[PDB]
Ligand binder design. Structure first.
Ligand SMILES: NC(=O)[C@H]1CCCN(C(=O)c2[nH]ncc2Br)C1
Ligand SMILES: [Zn+2]
Length: 140
């Protein structure tokens, strides 16, 4: 589990969105595993606007932050899971690291701010849903 709280937005994994998220929906994209809902309180996270390929992510199954090198956001074939069939997930970045299904929502960050959230894992891989292209998270 886990969310990004930027301005009056909550960014979660689409597959973990709550009823309250769907009832307060701003934007969702199944291809990216992303959903954004509106919040009453202002959040403290800042979004990175950069092409960093190194950063640090939170792994709930280890209670640990790990430094990683990650790929540029891409279209990646992701194996069928409890939440999606075998498909191409877009805007996904891959690194070597531990990721169990419940690690989804952990933040990946760089020197500039939040880069994305854990979206995929297994086999000693971890995939991150990028949010750096979502410039509207910074206004309105
Ligand atoms: N966005 C997706 O399609 C995800 C959904 C959860 C499962 N997915 C994984 O890769 C995964 N496997 N083991 C741990 C993890 Br995390 C695929
Ligand atoms: Zn950066």
């Amino acid at each position: 589990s886990g969310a990004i709280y930027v301005g009056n937005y909550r960014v979660v994994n689409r597959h973990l969105a709550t009823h309250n998220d769907w009832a307060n929906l701003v934007w969702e994209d199944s291809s990216r595993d992303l959903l954004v809902s509106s919040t009453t309180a202002q959040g403290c996270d800042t979004i990175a606007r950069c092409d960093c390929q190194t950063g640090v992510y939170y792994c709930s199954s280890r209670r640990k932050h790990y430094p990683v090198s990650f790929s540029k956001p891409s279209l990646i074939f992701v194996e069928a899971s409890e939440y999606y069939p075998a498909r191409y997930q877009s805007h996904l970045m891959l690194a070597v690291g531990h990721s169990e299904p419940g690690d989804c929502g952990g933040i990946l960050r760089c020197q500039h701010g939040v880069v994305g959230i854990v979206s995929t894992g297994g086999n000693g891989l971890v995939g991150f849903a990028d949010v750096r292209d979502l410039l509207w998270l910074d206004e309105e």
